[PDB]
């Protein structure tokens, strides 16, 4: 209990501590990240300009390019430019591109489609278990498949059988 709590406090601190220590101290140091790093971010804003043409990343290709179809009704062959990571981005996301020269500046956009909204219909039953009369057992066999691996997956994995679906 005590060992767990101290571990969590440390884990949280280490992500914070390290990130921060290198930065500010390198600002004092006369050669490493210093000015450059702060500038690099400023430099992405100025290069991109306004406006920004929106795209959707279908796939990244390992050749220093990606296929992003731009919002203009033609396809574009983008290059990893304007300081960006190819592998960092996961498929299907909407990305921001600098129009002036095609580059993916970064990822933040999704631009939400109505198709996901139709699918997600949350629960709130009329009647539900434990206000239903008789044949208590009949419900319990159903739980074996649906409920029980959600409540405790532990029993299933330890037994070592294919998880009921």
């Amino acid at each position: 209990t005590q060992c767990r709590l101290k571990l969590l406090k440390l884990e949280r601190i280490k992500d914070y501590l390290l990130m921060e220590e290198e930065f500010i101290r390198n600002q004092e140091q006369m050669k490493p990240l210093e000015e450059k790093q702060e500038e690099e971010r400023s430099k992405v804003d100025d290069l991109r300009g306004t406006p920004m043409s929106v795209g959707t990343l279908e796939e990244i290709i390992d050749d220093n390019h990606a296929i992003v179809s731009t919002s203009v009704g033609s396809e574009h062959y983008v290059s990893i430019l304007s300081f960006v990571d190819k592998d960092l981005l996961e498929p299907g996301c909407s990305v921001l591109l600098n129009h002036k020269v095609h580059a993916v500046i970064g990822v933040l956009m999704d631009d939400t489609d109505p198709l996901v909204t139709v699918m997600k219909v949350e629960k709130a039953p009329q009647e539900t278990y434990a206000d239903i009369g008789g044949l208590d057992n009949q419900i319990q066999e159903i739980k074996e498949s649906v409920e029980l691996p959600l409540t405790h997956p532990e029993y299933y994995e330890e037994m070592g059988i294919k998880p009921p679906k």
Binding site: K9, I13, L17, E20, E21, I24, R25, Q27, E28
Partner: peptide, 21 residues
């Protein structure tokens, strides 16, 4: 800048020295 650089990075809160991390 110089003073802030050392002061921020140091670890003392967790330590029994407690001058604040």
């Amino acid at each position: 800048i110089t003073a802030k650089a050392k002061k921020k990075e140091k670890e003392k809160e967790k330590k029994e020295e407690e001058k604040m991390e």
